Amino acid sequence: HMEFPFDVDALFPERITVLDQHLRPPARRPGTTTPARVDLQQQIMTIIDELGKASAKAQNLSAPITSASRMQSNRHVVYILKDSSARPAGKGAIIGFIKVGYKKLFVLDDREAHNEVEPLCILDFYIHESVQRHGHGRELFQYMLQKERVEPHQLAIDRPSQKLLKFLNKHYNLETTVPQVNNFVIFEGFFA
Ligand SMILES: CC(=O)SCCNC(=O)CCNC(=O)[C@H](O)C(C)(C)COP(=O)(O)OP(=O)(O)OC[C@H]1O[C@@H](n2cnc3c(N)ncnc32)[C@H](O)[C@@H]1OP(=O)(O)O
Ligand SMILES: [Cl-]
Predict the structure, then answer these.
(1) Outcome of mutating residue 112 to R, per the record?
(2) Residue 171 phi, psi dihedral angles, 5° rounding
(3) Domain of 72: which CATH number?
(4) If we measure between CA atoms, which residue out of 56, 126, 62 comes closest to residue 94?
(5) Which ligand number lies closest to the CA of residue 71?
(6) 55 vs 3, 129, 142, 173, 181, CA distance in Å?
(7) Which of 2, 11, 52, 154: disulfide with 66, CB 3.0–4.6 Å?
(8) What does the radius of gyration of the chain's CA atoms come to, in whole angstroms?
(9) Which domain holds residue 114?
């Protein structure tokens, strides 16, 4: 649970909200009423900024790798998990996010040859400390896999943490790796 100076439940009606470089405010049920979309977009930018900073602290990074500005200059896609039916039911509570995007990589296969590929990459991924290890990461990962239409073994991971390595092994049996020099991680089956 992390909170904001505005109504997160009104802004994000769905449990998982997908945003891309357009930072498009979700459509609300007819009524309603709604603040100007430019202002709703600013709210979204602030949420992404704060989520990025929170993930950086959790990962012991000196700067965020996720931000509103970087969302707008890159072709990233973020999935944001809110706590629907949070209590007390205040103005909403975001639980975490996952950010993905296609990146051109020079990948080493076994037999150690470099291959130019552009897989979908897991770029940032954070669940609030208070509720880590409760299954929310899996919720978010499963949803992303469905929307992106990809198989787990087809992914590359940008600098996975120890926690993420265990997570990927437990949920998707991604265990054996093919060593790279570019700080990305891929698993057996990536080359199928
Ligand atoms: C490319 C990247 O983004 S790299 C960085 C990934 N993000 C981070 O490391 C930030 C801090 N960690 C988190 O935000 C989360 O723990 C995530 C995103 C890695 C996983 O989400 P969670 O909600 O915790 O995972 P979820 O509950 O769905 O699944 C649990 C499994 O994840 C792994 N895991 C989660 N926390 C831990 C932990 N403290 N120690 C070891 N493994 C852990 C385990 O495999 C765990 O299963 P287990 O309890 O049976 O051992
Ligand atoms: Cl970003």
Answers:
(1) No effect on catalytic activity
(2) -80, -35
(3) 3.40.630.30
(4) 126
(5) 2
(6) 15, 10, 20, 25, 24
(7) 52
(8) 17
(9) 1-192
